[PDB]
Design a protein around this motif. Structure first.
Motif, PDB file in Angstrom:
ATOM      1  N   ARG A  52       0.823  -1.206   0.000  1.00  0.00           N
ATOM      2  CA  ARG A  52       0.000   0.000   0.000  1.00  0.00           C
ATOM      3  C   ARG A  52       0.858   1.258   0.000  1.00  0.00           C
ATOM      4  O   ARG A  52       0.817   2.052  -0.945  1.00  0.00           O
ATOM      5  N   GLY A  53       1.647   1.454   1.049  1.00  0.00           N
ATOM      6  CA  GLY A  53       2.489   2.628   1.184  1.00  0.00           C
ATOM      7  C   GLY A  53       3.927   2.227   1.449  1.00  0.00           C
ATOM      8  O   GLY A  53       4.472   1.320   0.822  1.00  0.00           O
ATOM      9  N   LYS A  54       4.547   2.933   2.390  1.00  0.00           N
ATOM     10  CA  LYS A  54       5.897   2.603   2.822  1.00  0.00           C
ATOM     11  C   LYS A  54       5.825   1.556   3.925  1.00  0.00           C
ATOM     12  O   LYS A  54       5.141   1.786   4.930  1.00  0.00           O
ATOM     13  N   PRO A  55       6.491   0.411   3.788  1.00  0.00           N
ATOM     14  CA  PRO A  55       6.380  -0.630   4.813  1.00  0.00           C
ATOM     15  C   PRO A  55       6.763  -0.109   6.189  1.00  0.00           C
ATOM     16  O   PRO A  55       7.267   1.000   6.364  1.00  0.00           O
ATOM     17  N   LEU A  56       6.492  -0.940   7.188  1.00  0.00           N
ATOM     18  CA  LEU A  56       6.830  -0.622   8.563  1.00  0.00           C
ATOM     19  C   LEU A  56       8.328  -0.774   8.792  1.00  0.00           C
ATOM     20  O   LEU A  56       9.002  -1.576   8.139  1.00  0.00           O
ATOM     21  N   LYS A  65       2.977  -3.161  17.800  1.00  0.00           N
ATOM     22  CA  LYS A  65       2.802  -2.497  16.513  1.00  0.00           C
ATOM     23  C   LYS A  65       3.098  -3.444  15.360  1.00  0.00           C
ATOM     24  O   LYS A  65       2.372  -3.463  14.361  1.00  0.00           O
ATOM     25  N   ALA A  68       0.229  -5.911  15.038  1.00  0.00           N
ATOM     26  CA  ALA A  68      -0.923  -5.219  14.477  1.00  0.00           C
ATOM     27  C   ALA A  68      -0.545  -4.545  13.165  1.00  0.00           C
ATOM     28  O   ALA A  68      -0.762  -3.341  12.993  1.00  0.00           O
ATOM     29  N   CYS A  69       0.015  -5.315  12.236  1.00  0.00           N
ATOM     30  CA  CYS A  69       0.470  -4.808  10.946  1.00  0.00           C
ATOM     31  C   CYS A  69      -0.053  -5.745   9.870  1.00  0.00           C
ATOM     32  O   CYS A  69       0.488  -6.839   9.679  1.00  0.00           O
ATOM     33  N   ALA A  70      -1.104  -5.320   9.168  1.00  0.00           N
ATOM     34  CA  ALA A  70      -1.706  -6.181   8.158  1.00  0.00           C
ATOM     35  C   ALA A  70      -0.709  -6.523   7.061  1.00  0.00           C
ATOM     36  O   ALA A  70      -0.631  -7.674   6.622  1.00  0.00           O
ATOM     37  N   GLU A  71       0.067  -5.536   6.609  1.00  0.00           N
ATOM     38  CA  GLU A  71       1.014  -5.773   5.524  1.00  0.00           C
ATOM     39  C   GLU A  71       2.081  -6.783   5.929  1.00  0.00           C
ATOM     40  O   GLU A  71       2.343  -7.753   5.208  1.00  0.00           O
TER      41      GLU A  71
HETATM   42  C1  LIG Z   1       1.976  -2.172   9.412  1.00  0.00           C
HETATM   43  N1  LIG Z   1       1.335  -1.759  10.426  1.00  0.00           N
HETATM   44  C2  LIG Z   1       2.121  -1.504   8.116  1.00  0.00           C
HETATM   45  N2  LIG Z   1       2.840  -2.027   7.087  1.00  0.00           N
HETATM   46  C3  LIG Z   1       2.688  -1.115   6.147  1.00  0.00           C
HETATM   47  N3  LIG Z   1       1.921  -0.115   6.577  1.00  0.00           N
HETATM   48  C4  LIG Z   1       1.404   1.037   5.858  1.00  0.00           C
HETATM   49  C5  LIG Z   1      -0.116   0.953   5.717  1.00  0.00           C
HETATM   50  O1  LIG Z   1      -0.748   0.080   6.288  1.00  0.00           O
HETATM   51  N4  LIG Z   1      -0.714   1.880   4.944  1.00  0.00           N
HETATM   52  C6  LIG Z   1      -0.031   2.954   4.223  1.00  0.00           C
HETATM   53  C7  LIG Z   1      -1.179   3.730   3.646  1.00  0.00           C
HETATM   54  C8  LIG Z   1      -1.156   4.906   2.910  1.00  0.00           C
HETATM   55  C9  LIG Z   1      -2.350   5.509   2.515  1.00  0.00           C
HETATM   56  C10 LIG Z   1      -2.349   6.816   1.803  1.00  0.00           C
HETATM   57  C11 LIG Z   1      -2.911   7.906   2.469  1.00  0.00           C
HETATM   58  C12 LIG Z   1      -2.915   9.161   1.887  1.00  0.00           C
HETATM   59  C13 LIG Z   1      -2.369   9.350   0.642  1.00  0.00           C
HETATM   60  C14 LIG Z   1      -1.808   8.286  -0.043  1.00  0.00           C
HETATM   61  C15 LIG Z   1      -1.792   7.021   0.525  1.00  0.00           C
HETATM   62  C16 LIG Z   1      -1.165   5.904  -0.257  1.00  0.00           C
HETATM   63  F1  LIG Z   1      -1.945   4.835  -0.336  1.00  0.00           F
HETATM   64  F2  LIG Z   1      -0.885   6.254  -1.504  1.00  0.00           F
HETATM   65  F3  LIG Z   1      -0.023   5.490   0.271  1.00  0.00           F
HETATM   66  C17 LIG Z   1      -3.533   4.865   2.869  1.00  0.00           C
HETATM   67  N5  LIG Z   1      -3.591   3.724   3.566  1.00  0.00           N
HETATM   68  C18 LIG Z   1      -2.425   3.180   3.942  1.00  0.00           C
HETATM   69  C19 LIG Z   1      -2.162   1.909   4.736  1.00  0.00           C
HETATM   70  N6  LIG Z   1       1.552  -0.336   7.860  1.00  0.00           N
END
Ligand SMILES: *C(=N)c1ncn(CC(=O)n2cc3cc(-c4ccccc4C(F)(F)F)cnc3c2)n1
Ligand SMILES: *C(=N)c1ncn(CC(=O)n2cc3cc(-c4ccccc4C(F)(F)F)cnc3c2)n1
Lengths: 707, 707
Positions: A52-56, A65, A68-71
């Motif tokens: 989704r985004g930047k990993p943990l 934490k 509780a990290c789906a990724e």
């Molecule tokens: C573990 N707890 C974990 N591993 C990875 N992450 C990140 C996560 O769950 N996550 C990142 C994002 C980013 C967005 C978002 C929000 C605003 C603008 C853009 C974005 C993006 F998707 F482009 F990145 C939304 N949801 C999540 C979930 N957590």
DNA sequence: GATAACAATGAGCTCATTGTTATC
DNA sequence: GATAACAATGAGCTCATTGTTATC
């Protein structure tokens, strides 16, 4: 498995598990590429999972934490990786290799580094296994040859030179810019687009830990400083190999992202602007923006003309921040706002969408960023197109005036707001040759008091007077405290039975709370003097981390506002000398040009020089023999005297001849006047022109607030 | 209640329930306005509830759909309204009045109408109760006086005339453009901003039912046609009253939204473009767009320069649709694409974000939309700024060539794709004076067959050959069938045990399925001939609803492509006459101008006319007395001969004098040549210049697909 | 009978990096 | 040792209207 977005390989977990591979896609663009690429190979042996985004970051992350990290849980389950287990090989894993298909930019490097940090931290024996971790590399610029890095294209472009005209360049900047044909081509030649990180020595783990450890911030500071202070010893990474090393990957690819993060987060010490804000300001100046336009239209213009490489939403947020003026925000905003740009209620978060807010340039933007200085700054060239300058040179240090707070990689800043008038007075004191008086942070619209608790540690105390009826009236909140946040704090405090009741009469610009507490509690607080202490009416202002970029581009730290003022004073005196020299040269050239024009018009009208029915070569030869100065074979002569023979027939009239002579004399007089003025005089004139405007701006804003 | 986003009034449900009010906010902008406004009144007596999108239509909606409606259920629970109950008053309701605070635009009118339809359909006795339903009206343009409708500002602006220069105009177009001061003022003057719908006669229910009933479609057609065919009898609604009638509200405010919906959904019959597509095309022409730019930058430019009043996402989708060229899409796209604009896999839905796709103008865009005709079309003026024309006039009917499908209010269209070459041939046949051959829909890149079943009901069948091994290979799908949709259909059919297996080798441009079924089933299908019938290889193309806008702006229906072709032929012949007349006039003016220039230059060189050291008034008087023709007191004379005395001194040379004489003769000869050409000849030349380019475009695209 | 496909409209909501400094 | 907040970034996803006309 049941993972929502997992295209698990058909042969995952069986006798062919160690021949499988998982692609940690960086969203949906890479998945679209994979849909077309993986079909050109053994799709049964390849899995895909978007991120989704930047990993943990699982080093500093707590156990709660991380769990509780789906990724992280999803990837661990897909790979069959357990925290408790210690895997010495891919024997127990559902896959034999793990490939990361991220964009070929800085954030892609960060994502790859975060995945490597995950794997190394939890299963350090898996990074030592050859071929377990892998990356997928794609070209960013193509000249249908494919270049995997921007410098290579620039190096190739420079080497080719004029031969690039015969080449058509396609920029695959984002990873979604490539469709199905590119996917098929890339996945046919997988070897060329698949590098496997190799663990050679014990320095690889050290590099990973340094890059992604909470205890090695200073090592990261040294990393970025040493990288930025190398003379061509950067040693950019090449992709012609397929055995990228972990330490090499870090020091050659993650350092680029860290430097970019610092560059985009830390502000310059001269103009006080970050690169995005500088691009917005430069685009606004280029437009001569004086009529309000939608912030979205401004964002589009900035992207088109300032070579902004990021999304609009970031640009909209940057413009909103540039325009905001509530207490705890810009002291002298450079962009005028028309709409809901945010208030102190939510700390600027309560602003309308870019489609609803208009903005332009404030009336004082060009009295700080003088137009003349636009001629003496150095302009960047991002892929040929001319772009923002390396830094603007305002009349006063706008880093101090407006205050900033950003977080980089290894470095972070916090610069408070200082009075533009105090700064102007100190600059005039320095100009006269006096010393500098101490400066404490100043915020406009703040009725509280800011006192220096320690060197670089001030305390702003929002004013609240206890009314003589058992109630306390809060009139001003400390800097950084938002009305909604204070409402939440008061509700939480009442939930603890500390205040009997409270009533709010808060306008979007002024604060007014009335809190009634138990008489015993109020009396005890008054006796102990902790009325403001217990009501959160004192907050800190930290001036102990004033980190900025000096003119040379190095991240430096300043003891307080005085060091910033002195450095800016030196750089600005040099640039005022540059501006005076440029103006003198331009005026001299203009005077010479108009002298030649007057001579030509006199020699034409007087009949000494005749132009009617004259061959072009003969007339230009005569003009050259007469000693007329060129002011850009046949083309060179035509362009040299395009200003003498390119003047309309209007100029051959009594009135226009007299006007031209007056213009020449005015230019000569202005040059003479400028030759008697030193850079200090020009700076003093600019400061004296700017100070009353700042005073009037503050008075007008005060009247508007009081209304 | 527990509704997630309900700010229920504190005095709701008590003895003061009938004095409460609920605001059906249209999102977050109105909620931001309310936060600042409601505090200036008895906030205890006012509730707020945002609405996500457009409410449900509960007339045609089934019971299941209505029940499975969080918005409707939420509002019913908040108001204490039950479907089963029959409320004769606000006695059992938790609120006494229900106010709708939507934007002051067409969609706001639609939302208010949908809420009124809800209330009337389920509790018809509540609309008859005075004051139960209410609306909140806000200004859209202010001249700090406030105007609640755009025509009023235009009427006021026209009445004032030159006096508007002393007024500063602020446009509160969106409802989020107003901050806290506006909210405070509006809710202080609530009487001026609160109109309560009143039920006077039985025509109010009839109007509501007509506007929001599934069987009153023809009544809606009559509604829109009668509204559009009125000569100043529109009777725009005024807001100086506080007793808006239900029938009056419908017929004066909802009709505007319905007309706007039809305008934005139905395409013009001349250029074939809808207003948004026309704005995009006009902006692209204005830029002289020939180098690819990001679609987001193009959207920003279109919004800034074409006065596009909607969001970017809609603009991005419109540009993507304009550029798409897959089978079942544009036959001759007007925008060139560079990126992932979508393929037949998902029917154009699989396109990258606007930040990743580039677009420009196709090489054939300006061979259909000739530049010359840009001078003869009528240009709209949306608030002073010049905007897109009322319609472009292409060389060929692009409504037929590209095909369209849109849904309005009362009207809906479906125009298939016809061959540009068939259309060109028919246009040439008409030009020669022959008749028109019938036209059946034609789609480029479709190897199937399109056969006319009935009048205006064609059937397109993709090719599938039963290979001599018990398997059938499908090589083309019928128009409108997407590869992913067919994969889903085949998977569903296999789930029913109809096909033993199937394999897909589908590229993003070509389809290749291989389906193996039970030999008995295949034999039975072959005997019955239903192989393509049972495999969904036949689909319908409906040319029975060709609804468009004629040049006069009235929505009309056309029997088939022949009626469209004939109407376009007439309008285009008229416009070619207009273009020939405009070109003749421009050439005549240019020839006169250049003859005057040659005379002036000859007189100056020969010494008959002397300009050196001559007073401006005397020289202009001499020029006037010599009979020189003006070509724009002192200012008028200066501007008339700016083209004579504005000539550069270059023109007073042998070479330049000869070049000017040659230019005059070239202009005269070109005018003479144009005077001997009729509009039919110009149209034939354009068609003969366009036809080979279309043939080459199709050949090149075919080669690209084959490769 | 009631869905299903079609296109022009519409906006908030989601959370991780990175370093300082204070509470906790 | 564990949170809180600060700013520059990053993208998918959710569902109603409106009319036609085929097939369930
Ligand atoms: C573990 N707890 C974990 N591993 C990875 N992450 C990140 C996560 O769950 N996550 C990142 C994002 C980013 C967005 C978002 C929000 C605003 C603008 C853009 C974005 C993006 F998707 F482009 F990145 C939304 N949801 C999540 C979930 N957590
Ligand atoms: C009853 N079943 C009912 N009542 C009202 N509605 C509509 C609804 O629940 N709803 C509409 C929307 C619209 C969007 C959306 C999607 C894309 C772009 C914009 C938007 C919008 F929010 F701006 F409208 C998202 N969710 C919903 C929910 N159903």
């Amino acid at each position: 498995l049941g993972i929502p977005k997992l295209d698990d390989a058909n042969e995952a977990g069986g006798k062919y598990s160690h021949r499988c591979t998982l692609i940690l896609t960086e969203g949906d663009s890479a998945k679209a590429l994979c849909t077309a690429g993986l079909a050109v190979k053994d799709r049964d042996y390849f899995g895909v999972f978007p991120l989704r985004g930047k990993p943990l970051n699982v080093r500093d992350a707590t156990l709660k934490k991380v769990m509780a990290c789906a990724e992280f849980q999803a990837v661990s389950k897909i790979m069959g990786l357990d925290i408790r287990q210690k895997y010495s090989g891919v024997e127990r894993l559902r896959y034999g290799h793990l490939m990361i298909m991220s964009d070929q930019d800085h954030d892609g490097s960060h994502i790859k580094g975060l995945i490597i940090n995950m794997i190394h931290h939890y299963w350090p024996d898996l990074i030592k296994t050859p071929g377990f971790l892998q990356q997928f590399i794609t070209p960013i610029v193509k000249a249908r040859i494919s270049f995997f890095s921007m410098p290579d294209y620039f190096e190739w472009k420079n080497a080719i030179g004029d031969g690039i005209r015969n080449y058509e360049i396609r920029y695959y900047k984002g990873l979604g810019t490539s469709g199905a044909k590119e996917g098929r081509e890339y996945f046919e030649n997988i070897d060329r687009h698949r590098l496997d990180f190799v663990h050679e020595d014990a320095t690889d783990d050290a590099r990973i830990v340094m890059a992604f450890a909470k205890d090695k911030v200073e090592e990261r500071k040294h990393w970025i400083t040493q990288f930025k202070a190398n003379t061509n010893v950067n040693e950019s990474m090449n992709y012609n190999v397929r055995t990228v090393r972990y330490s090499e990957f870090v020091d050659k690819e993650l350092i680029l992202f860290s430097v970019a993060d610092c560059e985009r987060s830390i502000p310059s010490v001269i103009d006080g602007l970050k690169p995005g804000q500088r691009k917005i300001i430069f685009s606004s100046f280029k437009r001569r923006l004086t009529r309000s336009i939608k912030v979205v239209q401004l964002a589009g213009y900035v992207s088109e003309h300032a070579a902004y490489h990021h999304g609009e939403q970031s640009l909209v947020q940057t413009i909103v921040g540039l325009a905001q003026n509530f207490v705890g925000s810009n002291n002298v905003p450079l962009l005028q706002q028309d709409g809901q740009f945010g208030t102190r209620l939510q700390g600027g978060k309560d602003h309308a969408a870019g489609r609803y807010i208009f903005t332009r340039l404030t009336n004082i933007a060009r009295y700080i960023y003088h137009p003349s200085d636009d001629f003496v700054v150095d302009y960047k060239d991002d892929d040929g197109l001319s772009v923002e300058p390396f830094y603007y040179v305002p009349v006063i240090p706008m880093v101090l005036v407006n205050g900033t707070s950003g977080i980089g990689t290894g470095f972070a800043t916090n610069i408070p707001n200082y009075s533009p008038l105090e700064v102007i007075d100190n600059l005039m004191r320095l100009l006269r040759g006096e010393e500098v008086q101490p400066m404490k942070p100043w915020y406009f619209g703040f009725a509280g008091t800011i006192e220096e608790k320690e060197k670089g540690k001030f305390v702003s105390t929002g004013c609240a007077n206890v009314r003589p009826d058992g109630v306390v009236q809060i009139t001003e909140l400390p800097i950084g405290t938002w009305t909604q946040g204070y409402k939440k704090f008061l509700e939480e405090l009442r939930e603890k039975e500390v205040v009997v009741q409270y009533r709010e009469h808060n306008t979007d610009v002024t604060v007014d709370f009335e809190v009634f507490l138990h008489p015993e509690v109020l009396h005890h607080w008054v006796a102990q003097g902790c009325v403001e202490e217990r009501l959160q009416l004192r907050e800190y202002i930290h001036a102990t981390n004033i980190i900025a970029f000096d003119r040379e581009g190095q991240i430096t730290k300043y003891r307080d506002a005085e060091a910033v003022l002195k450095e800016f004073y030196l750089v600005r005196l040099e640039y005022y000398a540059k501006r005076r020299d440029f103006l003198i040269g331009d005026l001299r050239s203009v005077a010479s040009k108009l002298e030649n024009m007057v001579r030509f018009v006199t020699e034409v009208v007087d009949g000494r020089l005749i132009v009617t029915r004259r061959r072009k070569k003969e007339l230009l030869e005569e003009l050259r023999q007469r000693g007329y100065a060129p002011f850009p074979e046949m083309r060179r002569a035509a362009r040299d005297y395009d200003y003498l023979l390119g003047m309309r027939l209007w100029n051959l009239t009594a009135e226009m001849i007299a006007r031209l002579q007056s213009q020449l004399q005015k230019a000569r007089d202005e040059l003479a006047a400028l030759e008697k003025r030193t850079p200090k005089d020009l700076w003093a004139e600019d400061l004296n022109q700017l100070r009353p405007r700042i005073e009037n701006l503050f008075e007008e804003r005060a009247k508007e607030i009081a209304s």
